[PDB]
């Protein structure tokens, strides 16, 4: 009926549990579209994906597709204002982003459901009439340069690019996609290159509709969205641009049978094994790479990892298919290395080849495939509802590779068993086709080459033919066996009827000296899943640095020992997490409820009757020592946040204290620790999901009985159940703690204005001021003043106390940052004074909607409940109570609050700043007038600082 | 001049004693000792009448005690009753008195400038006392108060019960305290005028010939002679023959008798007594001291060692017990285990076996010689005594020894008399034994009740078969005589005062492992040193279990080291070792000579200690009963104990500790000790006859002994955390209520928390406490008659302070609250009205008290140790704080009360603890009080309030 529509796709295959409605169609200009109708959604979204990226970049400008990614969303003929799209989405509780890959430039946003047409109209105009405003040319270069400079000191980005540089330089795969100040400014200036004209050349030659895909999600019907997208996207130019393909592999003979020795930033030992393979995409209905990745990357009994671990060579492994570009892919086998693993690289690889050879001897297995196909079927069926912004962005890219009807089922379903394709792929995984890379600090001052884009230090060798022959002739290994029938595969998906005694919030169904049990039966999602949360309290887990180290190692060793068993459950959508806390231990079991008690039983049984293997203990003790030293390689803002937590909490063991006390951790001392730690405990739990009241009680009893029987567990005294207090800062006080980051040449800062103890009134005073200043903070400090890559503002909540926080990572000294934040606070006071009641009520309403936002998955609901339980505040109806009080708030109340608590001259001001210096550092112009800042009290000793100040009380519970 | 009957020869003193002495007998028969000490801060005098309670008329019990109370209540020269106490209060003085069975000792101290003034008031009570009728009823309520206090005390209960089981016609059977019944109720019923009987007794017994006067002053011996003659030569001589009681109060019918007594506390004791002749005459030889030393010995081969080894007894006390002139006793008292209580006959057999070993081996001259040598050293290097107690003690012993031997008397032994040792030993036989067993296992199984205390007991005759068994006691090979004591000091060298010596302790070491404070003694010059150590460990108080483990570890350590340590303790080298809320405390005191040997053994034992399973179980049981036994402590103590739990950050209760005790196993304790000693911090004070280098060597030795045997590493500074005081809110009032199940008396503690300690805050509080001190006693105790215990003063804990009131009364706690509140108003008025002259008198009185210089090393060390344990280190505090006190005004104090303590103060921080009586249900105008916040749960109360900072240390 409509000439603007080429074809309306048939039924879009979806999960029976999916209530969202789908319509697929192709427009006359060649745009592939998917319309998502969700009358339930709080946020409406859209995405456009151009099948052009950084592999198409011109030789003259490296990072041009990525620079276009920035320059395209700056002004349009309909909306000449550069920041229109950004402002509209900010004004209507939205957000936007984009990314550039080698073959795609994806653009996306979300907005309040009532404003889809307005946001989409602004979005569509960039694909119709862009202007590329010459005024933002230099700031975008700096935004792209800031992105790369952040990546430069990242080990993964370094490796990613070093791999690209060690392939065929004549191949597009070797291109540097990010760009920088050099590639976008310095170099084009020297060569008399017109950056804007080269950008427009690129835009006009590649950005065509035939290579585009659109996804629109909203409350509006399928037909209303069909009209909206036709109106907005049938006018987009169709220059019939051919799809860029790369059939030739960037890895030719001279790039095979090669060995690379790389120097990292962090003290990490890793082995990377790669095989170039053809492009397997077209075989998505059988997916041979997934079959082989499942087996090679298996962690159960008889796996390659198991043997490599037993040999004491590796702890972790990753195996499978890795995307390349249209025409090529890679097969990887990635492992970490123990000190002995680094010495037995050749041996490890021999074992890798022995496992690959076992699969050849055994041949493909239909039963392994049946499990994989059946599991993905259950996965797709009971899958959680997606965040619309990520959902659209994802589908936009997927539309290019699959028929309209298969874009939901694409990466989930398996149909045909193709053992011939498995045999085809497995045949490329051979020693004459291997590329080997070792990453070790031991290569420092022993390297001859440099990757210039990042500065990575490496050496390259050709692998001796005698090493290749040993891998080819590799003898059989009986330790390697194919996995067994996965008994963890779920079968019972019955949604237990909603009980007569069912409550809207978690109810305390057990209250004893040993345990406090909070339970809720899911009354919203109705998926066969549940979340089991346990917090085990012991004063012996943080009494001193030694015991803290021992509580860490205990649980690392426990997860390691349970790994081979737990893996099968993980594959069957049942996962667990076990971490030590500053009060004891945390256990979470998520996923399908069916086989959930079995894994829980095993976890607690292992906990209570743990037999430590000396070899594992020594390997894990070494890796934890490295992990301690590796904190220095973390970013300055991350360090700043770590120092404030130390400073502000009553008891807190530093990384320096923990590593000093690690040497004293012996195997008998640890063997003595476990019964002592488990001798006396309090357990506080939350069991939420597809469970009944009597089932939750039986779970808790099983947990109790296992600890009582095997560990001889007894409860703790209520006087022993004590939490740490926050430091109480003095009125009109300002303290500064300074430290240096030795890895990065940027500064870090956290500015904390401590207000008072949390309450309905105090929370909403702070949250309203935070709501008001939120967007301006980013546009001022980040966009206008260009302070740093990281600019953050919001409430800080710790130990029942709260306040206002500012986190910034800049190239400018922390003391300059101090004066800028202070000027901004004055501007915000002016803004609140000057703003209208209409603009003020919009803030109260924006915050109110965010706080009343319904959780969209069970885990999101449980996380809200868990927060109230771990804070011991138990205010499950918080949002309603606090939103009712917020609506009564006046402009003058926030002005008074600022005047008394936050202002430079406020009578009750409590400012504490943490300054993290850059690697090389030492300690008008139409900008806001910064006030006069007093002399800070410089903190020299964390203990003396705490000893000289009072500590706050602890917040009283609701229940 | 002729008023002196004779002047004694040289008064034998120590060459180390710089004080001058003069003895003389007055014409009226008064024996006198004069002490000339120009350096003395306080001067003192004491008069002792050799007549006591054993002289009371049978129809008026406690009359001698009553005369003591009525004597110092006005005279002809000084008619007002308040005169004497008032005079001493105005001139930095004090006074007290005690009545025993044979003596009435009256004594005082005053400023060294006001000796003549004070002694003149004192002297009149021995010339023309008035005995004011106004105080008759108040003094009876005072004597009745003292007896009612002792009524629930197990030691006073036994003391009287023993006296109720002998010859009733013997003066020893007398109740010497008296009460409202014996001094008021019964005499009125019998038509006895107590006043005339009081005057009768005083006339008959208060004779100068039975009196001894001791005077200590800055004044010369010649000037002291003139003063004591001027005042005491007029005391009338009634020529009273000194009473004697040579019959033994236990005649044949009272021998071979078994007594079964019910206690208040869950205690188990065995008392074995032998009536003996009055050995006082043999004081130069002293055979009772000899046998006491051997029978009571705690070293290898001793009676105790075997009784411990068998698992029957933990402790033993042996030797002569004083009776009166004419009779004495020889005792062997032990405590019992659950098993000792079932093996009493076996314990006494073992006692008799040991006695027989002393017979078979005969007397040892070297044993006597060692005692002689030890008393010579102990007399020579005797610490300087506070004048008040020094005069009091001499006034008593003046009666017993010649003038010249009054100081050496209780010390020096001369001739070895094996004949006497055989004579005394011949009395230690089963035919002459008396046995008493104290145990709750007798509750409901007794027939008699002691009338004065209500003590429940049974009397039995020891069977002839049991006596015969004990008589036939074999020789036991387990008993061996003690060996030569290798702890006897020989090196008495006083090291020269170093060029770099300091007046206060100096920080001579500040490492991660230890903080060492040192001071060479520049005051006393006796061959002694005090070695104090604080060991910090987060594992000594992490939970109630570790706390019990810390207690038991040191108790077992002290137990195991006892046989070795006793020899040192006899040789004047004692030690203390106890668990703290932060770790452990060790103190080594006495003669420096053998001091590092003992300290090396204690530190070695700490680390290489091996636990005996039998002792562990025994000590564990002893500690479980000790926790329970707290229920029998006074209600005011209970009230003090609860406020320490309420106001401290972390504090494990007696209930939590006793609940944790069953989890203390032997493998658990063995795992704990290596763990506790693994990481330590030591804070020490080494004060005495030592050099800087000697101190450093001592600290290094302690550190190295721990490093070697325990692999000790230092803690992190971040781990050296001290508990905080709960910060009370402004205008707040919290009440905590409990009950005392044992006592029918109420206990209370009222705390007005002020602020953190600082020069200004300390002196505000201390000056306010000075002003209200006597009035609090006079109003609430004397006038209102609230109770025996009425206390007011500053409270100091965790760098914080405030005002406190402690009252033990039979009246309910809420009443005391309003009466204390009424008193606060009364003082608010009293301060506004008092003169500048009256105000300055309070400043001077506090200044004098605060500047009162220590008389011995121990007292100086204690002052320094207090500065160390608080982590304030303000050694020059007393000078600084007094200088500031002298700048304070009546206005400054008025401001402080109105802001912090007044019923309507803006910053009033009140917390009260109420401990009700056993039976209890759950005048100036008192102000209106708000409704208090009742503390249900101690932890929730603590969680709901903030915590104070910790006081900043005073740096050099
Ligand atoms: C993309 O960036 C790079 O190219 N980086 C370069 C190399 C490092 C390198 C290499 N060679 C060089 C040669 C010369 C010079 C320098 C060199 C540098 C690199 C770095 C990191 C890196 O990260 C890994 C993720 C890569 C994503 C693909 C993938 C996903 C999942 C799985 N597999 C799994 O998650 C599997 C499942 C697969 C599907 C079936 C079920 C199993 N499973 C699950 C969890 C763990 C388990 N053991 C396992 O196995 C495999 C691939 C990849 C490559
Ligand atoms: C004062 O109160 C009473 O009398 N109460 C009565 C009885 C309990 C009783 C008894 N029998 C009864 C019969 C029938 C009915 C009721 C009865 C009740 C009692 C209670 C407590 C009591 O307390 C004990 C002290 C009593 C002082 C005499 C003394 C001092 C020191 C030493 N001996 C030592 O200090 C010796 C040294 C002596 C000198 C040379 C060196 C050794 N040494 C040192 C310390 C420890 C060591 N094991 C030791 O041995 C001996 C006696 C005394 C008596
Ligand atoms: Zn970018
Ligand atoms: Zn009295």
UniProtKB/Swiss-Prot annotation, chain A:
What controls how active this protein is? Activated by small peptides. Activated by ATP and GTP, and to a lesser extent by CTP, TTP and PPPi. Inhibited by bacitracin. In vitro modification of Cys residues impairs enzyme activity.
Q: Where does ATP bind?
A: 387, 853-859
| Effect listed in the UniProt record for changing residue 775 to C | Increases catalytic rate towards INS and amyloid
Protein's recorded name: Insulin-degrading enzyme
Organism of origin is: Homo sapiens
Reaction it catalyzes: Degradation of insulin, glucagon and other polypeptides. No action on proteins
User: Keywords for this entry?
Assistant: Allosteric enzyme, ATP-binding, Cell membrane, Cytoplasm, Host cell receptor for virus entry, Host-virus interaction, Hydrolase, Membrane, Metal-binding, Metalloprotease, Nucleotide-binding, Protease, Receptor, Secreted, Zinc
* EC main group: hydrolase
TM regions (residue ranges): none
- Which residues carry the post-translational modification N6-succinyllysine, per the record? 150, 655
How changing residue 384 to C affects the protein? Answer: Increases catalytic rate towards INS and amyloid
Q: Where is this motif: SlyX motif?
A: 811-816
* Chain positions recorded as Zn(2+) binding sites: 66, 70, 147
């Amino acid at each position: 009926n409509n000439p603007a529509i080429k074809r309306i796709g048939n039924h879009i295959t979806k999960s029976p549990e999916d209530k969202r409605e789908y319509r697929g169609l192709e427009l006359a200009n060649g745009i592939k579209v998917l319309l998502i109708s969700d009358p339930t959604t709080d946020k409406s979204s859209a995405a456009l994906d151009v099948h052009i990226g950084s592999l198409s970049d011109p030789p003259n400008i490296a990072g041009l597709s990525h620079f276009l990614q920035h320059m395209l969303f700056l002004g349009t003929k309909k909306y000449p204002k550069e920041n229109e799209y950004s402002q509209f989405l900010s004004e209507h509780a939205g957000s936007s982003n984009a990314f550039t890959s080698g073959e795609h430039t994806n653009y996306y946003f979300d907005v309040s459901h009532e404003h889809l047409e307005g946001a989409l109209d602004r979005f569509a105009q960039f694909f119709l009439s862009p202007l590329f405003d010459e005024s933002a040319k230099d700031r975008e270069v700096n935004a792209v340069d800031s992105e790369h400079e952040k990546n430069v000191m990242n080990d993964a980005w370094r490796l990613f690019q070093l791999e690209k540089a060690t392939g065929n330089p004549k191949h597009p795969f070797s291109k540097f996609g990010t760009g920088n100040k050099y590639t976008l400014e310095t170099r084009p200036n020297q060569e008399g290159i017109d950056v804007r004209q080269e950008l427009l050349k690129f835009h006009s030659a590649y950005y065509s509709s035939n290579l585009m895909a659109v996804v629109v999600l909203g409350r509006e019907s399928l037909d209303d969205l069909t009209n909206l997208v036709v109106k907005l996207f049938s006018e987009v130019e169709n220059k019939n641009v051919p799809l860029p393909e790369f059939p030739e592999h960037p890895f030719q003979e001279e790039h095979l049978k090669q060995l690379y020795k790389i120097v990292p930033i962090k003290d990490i030992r890793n082995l990377y094994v790669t095989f170039p393979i053809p492009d397997l995409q077209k075989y998505y209905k059988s997916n041979p790479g997934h079959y082989l990745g499942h087996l090679i990357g298996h962690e159960g009994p008889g796996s390659l990892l198991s043997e490599l671990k037993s040999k004491g060579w590796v702890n972790t492994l990753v195996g499978g298919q890795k995307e390349g570009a249209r025409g090529f892919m890679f097969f990887i086998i990635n492992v970490d290395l123990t000190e002995e693993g680094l010495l037995h690289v050749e041996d490890i690889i021999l074992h890798m080849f022995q496992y690959i050879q076992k699969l050849r001897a055994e041949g493909p297995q239909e039963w392994v495939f049946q499990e994989l196909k059946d599991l993905n079927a259950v996965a797709f069926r009971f899958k959680d509802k997606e965040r619309p912004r990520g959902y659209t962005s994802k589908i936009a890219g997927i539309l290019h590779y699959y028929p309209l009807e298969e874009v939901l089922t694409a990466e989930y379903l398996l149909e045909e068993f193709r053992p011939d394709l498995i045999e085809m792929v497995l045949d490329k995984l051979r020693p004459e086709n291997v590329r080997v890379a070792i990453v070790s600090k031991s290569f420092e001052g022993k390297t001859d080459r440099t990757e210039e884009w990042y500065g990575t230090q490496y050496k390259q060798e050709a692998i001796p033919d005698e090493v290749i022959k040993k891998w080819q002739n590799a003898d059989l290994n009986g330790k390697f066996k194919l996995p067994t029938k996965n008994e963890f595969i779920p079968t019972n998906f019955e949604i237990l009827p909603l009980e007569k005694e069912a409550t809207p919030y978690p109810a305390l169904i057990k209250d004893t000296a040993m345990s406090k049990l909070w339970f809720k039966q899911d009354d919203k999602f109705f998926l066969p899943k549940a979340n089991l949360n346990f917090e085990f309290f012991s004063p012996f887990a943080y009494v001193d640095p030694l015991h803290s180290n021992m509580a860490y190692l205990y649980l690392e060793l426990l997860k390691d020992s349970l790994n081979e068993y737990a893996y099968a459950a993980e594959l069957a959508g049942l996962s667990y997490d076990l971490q030590n806390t500053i009060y004891g231990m945390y256990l979470s079991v998520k996923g399908y409820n069916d086989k959930q008690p079995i894994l829980l039983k095993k976890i607690i049984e292992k906990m209570a009757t743990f037999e430590i293997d000396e070899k594992r203990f020594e390997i894990i003790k070494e890796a934890y020592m490295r992990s301690l030293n590796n904190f220095r390689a973390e970013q300055p803002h991350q360090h700043a946040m770590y120092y404030l937590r130390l400073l502000m909490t009553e008891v807190a063991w530093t990384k320096d204290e923990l590593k000093e006390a690690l040497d004293d951790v012996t195997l008998p001392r640890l063997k003595a620790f476990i019964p002592q730690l488990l001798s006396r405990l309090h357990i506080e739990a939350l069991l939420h999901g597809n469970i009944t009241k009597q089932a939750a009680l039986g779970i808790m009893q099983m947990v109790e009985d296992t600890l009582i029987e095997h560990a001889h567990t007894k409860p703790l005294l209520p006087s022993q159940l004590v939490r740490y207090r926050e430091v109480q800062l003095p009125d009109r006080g300002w303290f500064v703690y300074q430290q240096r980051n030795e890895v990065h040449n940027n500064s870090g800062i956290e500015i904390y204005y401590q207000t008072d103890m949390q309450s309905t009134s105090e929370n909403m005073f702070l949250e309203l001021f935070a709501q008001i200043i939120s967007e301006p903070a980013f546009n001022t400090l980040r966009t206008k003043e260009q302070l740093g890559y990281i600019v953050f503002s919001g409430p800080r909540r710790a130990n029942g106390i709260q306040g206002l926080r500012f986190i910034i990572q800049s190239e400018k000294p922390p003391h300059y940052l101090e004066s800028r934040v202070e000027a901004f606070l004055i501007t915000m006071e002016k803004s609140i004074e000057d703003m209208t009641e209409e603009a003020f009520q919009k803030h109260i309403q924006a915050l109110a909607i965010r706080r009343l936002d319904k959780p969209k998955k069970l885990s999101a609901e449980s996380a809200k409940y868990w927060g109230e339980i771990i804070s011991q505040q138990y205010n499950f109806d918080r949002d309603n109570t606090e939103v009712a009080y917020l609506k009564t708030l006046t402009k003058e109340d926030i002005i008074k609050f600022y005047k008394e608590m936050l202002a430079v001259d406020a009578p009750r001001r409590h400012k504490v700043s943490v300054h993290v210096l850059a690697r090389e550092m030492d300690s008008d112009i139409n900008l806001s007038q910064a006030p006069a800042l007093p002399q800070p009290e410089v903190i020299q000793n964390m203990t003396e600082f705490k000893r000289g100040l009072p500590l706050f009380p602890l917040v009283k519970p609701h229940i």
